[PDB]
């Protein structure tokens, strides 16, 4: 029974591969050759935020394009003001191993969680003048690796037990769960329509998840090593992807193909974070070699270097209005580049 | 600080700075230790004696005014690669091992070999523990199960002259105990090139003095680190 049950599986995925192969006519580069190159960006370090004790693990830009939130492993979650370099709030923590932060689109709640297998919800704007935990969410076996806000009452969490789970704060239980990943998923990104989201586990594959019905829709492969960072495209019909083999790739939802690959042999370290630009011409990509290069999105030619970090770069983020980019590192120093 | 609002904002920032520097002063004089190991090993007993799917069961203890943090692992998955690089500021690793099973020994050696060769877990010393000595002694007295059943190399082995047996202790027990000890130490000395040092120990829980052992091991570890930093070693 097992021998025959599989044979149709190989036949069907072979048919899928044949359909995928016989669906391409050209790559992006040969069609984009007739484009004026991008030119040197020459970014400068406008600011340098500091005050963290241990090494930063994540950061997230507020919707107002003025506030940002950072979480480090010393058990602290500070909220800065990116223009005047002040400190709005400084929230302590219960678990000293936090690797996730998320600032709500409205600007009310902050969520963070790590090896404790719990996402906490903090209520910034209260009648009280103190930030207090709202509702701890439990139900994941492994460590939580990413978390995003669909709405003000619908958080989405990506865990280490190979199961993603859509939550509901007012009720307080998983209204939907996702299965289909062998490895532990370590990346989560939301579509601009908030109707879909993709994720990438350690088995070198990414899958598209339909939020409403609550199950997968598409699968994406093409990487050798695990996946450390994923991010959509501003149009919403593409998404970049990071890995550990010094290669970051661009994928297509509509065509279900592998369009373009970004790689240069002078770098052997791994991509740690990927973020796009509000226009889509650039593709930022941090590296373990202490460097944060800038990749052109249409020609694969490097368009400048943003060195200046004394240790590993862990997280990036482009501004919502698109005027600045912030990189966090393991040397406990946030830098507001521009 | 042009207006009054910015003055109040920088006042609030100054208060936050004072709180953060106080927390840094509290944070800078504490030593953090992992507690890797296994299941049949007496993690629960020892962690209670120092005195829900949560993945961290952190415990604190104090000896001679020094502060140690016991980051005991919890109900995670068997895979141990993506949350191990997070531990690079720790001082040592207490690798508890059970030595009264005769069959989990090989898996324990495999686990120790995996821990002693991780790229991230380099320049981190290991404080190995042996546990359940009384059970091993009783098994030696009982007979039946033998090391030769699983490890045939025990017979062609003699106790080292460096052994320091306690009163009693039929020297067959000593031969076996030092057999496991030498196995773990040869696994440790297989690599390392003098950048992190193993530290074997012979405990049995049941309120035997252990915090002193971690204290002495950490003192030696930090002293050797400082001596190496100043080109004195």
């Amino acid at each position, epitope marked *: 029974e097992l021998d025959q049950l599989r044979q149709e599986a190989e036949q069907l995925k072979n048919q899928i591969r044949d359909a995928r192969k016989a669906c391409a006519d050209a790559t992006l580069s040969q069609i984009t050759n007739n484009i004026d190159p991008v030119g040197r960006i020459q970014m400068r370090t406008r600011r340098t935020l500091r005050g963290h004790l241990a090494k930063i693990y994540a950061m997230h830009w507020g919707t107002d394009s003025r506030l940002l939130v950072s979480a480090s492993q010393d058990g602290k979650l500070i909220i800065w*003001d990116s223009y005047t370099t002040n400190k709005v709030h400084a929230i302590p923590l219960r678990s000293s191993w936090v690797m996730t932060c998320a600032y709500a689109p409205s600007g009310n709640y902050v969520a963070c969680g790590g090896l404790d297998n719990i996402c906490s919800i903090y209520n910034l704007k209260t009648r009280e003048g103190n930030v207090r935990v709202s509702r701890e969410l439990a139900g994941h076996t492994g460590y939580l690796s990413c978390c995003r806000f669909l709405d003000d009452n619908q958080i989405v969490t990506s865990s280490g037990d190979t199961t993603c789970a859509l939550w509901d704060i007012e009720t307080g239980q998983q209204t939907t769960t996702f299965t289909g990943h062998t490895g532990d998923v370590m990346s989560l990104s939301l579509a601009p329509d908030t109707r879909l989201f993709v994720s990438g586990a350690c088995d070198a594959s990414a899958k598209l998840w339909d939020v409403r019905e609550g199950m997968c829709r598409q699968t994406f492969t093409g990487h050798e090593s695990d996946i450390n960072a994923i991010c959509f495209f501003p149009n919403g019909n593409a998404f970049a992807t990071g890995s550990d083999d010094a290669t970051c790739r661009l994928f297509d939802l509509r065509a279900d193909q592998e369009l373009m690959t970004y790689s240069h042999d002078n770098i052997i370290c791994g991509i740690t974070s990927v973020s796009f630009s509000k226009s889509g011409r650039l593709l930022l990509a941090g590296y373990d070699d202490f460097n944060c290069n800038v990749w052109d999105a249409l020609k694969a030619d490097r368009a400048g270097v943003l060195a200046g970090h004394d240790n590993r770069v862990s997280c990036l983020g482009v501004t919502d209005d698109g005027m600045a980019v912030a990189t966090g590192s393991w040397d406990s120093f946030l830098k507001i580049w521009n | 600080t042009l*207006s009054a609002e910015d003055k109040a904002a920088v006042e609030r920032s100054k*208060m936050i700075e004072k709180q953060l520097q106080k927390d840094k002063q509290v944070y800078r004089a504490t030593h953090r230790l992992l507690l890797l190991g296994a299941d049949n090993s007496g993690k629960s007993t020892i962690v209670k004696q120092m005195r829900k799917t949560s993945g961290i069961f952190e415990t604190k203890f104090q000896v001679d005014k020094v502060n140690f943090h016991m980051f005991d692992v919890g109900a995670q998955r068997d895979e141990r690669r993506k949350w191990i690089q997070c531990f690079n500021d720790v001082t040592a690793i207490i690798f508890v091992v059970d030595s009264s099973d005769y069959n989990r020994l090989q898996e324990a050696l495999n686990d120790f070999k995996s821990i002693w060769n991780n790229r991230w877990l380099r320049t981190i010393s290991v404080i190995l523990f042996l546990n359940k000595q009384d059970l091993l002694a009783e098994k030696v007295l009982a007979g039946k199960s033998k090391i030769e059943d699983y490890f045939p190399e025990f017979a062609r082995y003699t106790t080292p002259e460096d052994a320091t047996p306690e009163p009693g202790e039929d020297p067959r027990v000593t031969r076996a105990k030092y057999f496991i000890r030498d196995e773990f130490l040869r696994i440790s000395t297989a690599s390392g090139d003098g950048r992190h040092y193993c530290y074997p120990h012979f405990t049995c829980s049941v309120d035997t003095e252990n915090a002193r052992r971690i204290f002495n091991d950490c003192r030696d570890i930090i002293q050797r680190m400082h001596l190496r930093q100043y080109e004195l070693l």
Partner: single-chain antibody
Amino acid sequence: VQLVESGGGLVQPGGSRKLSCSASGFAFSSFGMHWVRQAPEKGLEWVAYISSGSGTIYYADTVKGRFTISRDDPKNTLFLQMTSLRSEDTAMYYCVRSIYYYGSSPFDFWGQGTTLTVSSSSDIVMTQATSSVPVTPGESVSISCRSSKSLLHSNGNTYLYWFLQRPGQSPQLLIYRMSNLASGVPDRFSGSGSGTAFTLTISRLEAEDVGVYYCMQHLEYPLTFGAGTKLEL
């Protein structure tokens, strides 16, 4: 949350008294504290201001070296001591809560107040065009506020507060920064201006709108107040 005060009464001139505004139900150690002065037959006036960390201390230009303030963080109590009281120093005194950071809404909460009876320049000046107008429940009501200087700041913030105290209770907040709505007010009030004169508009009028409106400015230490426009239906 609630603010309670003790004291009051009639005091002969030249004496001294100690009154307190006790706070219970919030974090008293993270809120700036203010004091206001309002005669029973006149408008509102500023008294003092104390920062959260007691590092910045401001006083009214009228009284600078005579009045004194003090706060007690463990008990969440705040004290005022009066020295050489005068007959003119007879008005309503309120203790006002405020917290300062980006996006905050200062002067949000108000206390109950106490009654004190005594037996018998180059700063920005502001005025109100009118003092009493007749309106009807269902038409539009417009009130104008005018200042003597352009309040627009380099950052881009125009500082304007409206309170609209009702006849019988402490005042509230409707609009801050000339454009931002308050917390629990209905979606019926708005403000606009060009940099010199400000106007307030109300869409619908109900029985809850009966009261006197106050116009406020917050640019420098003096913290000037308005005159007031009573509304009769």
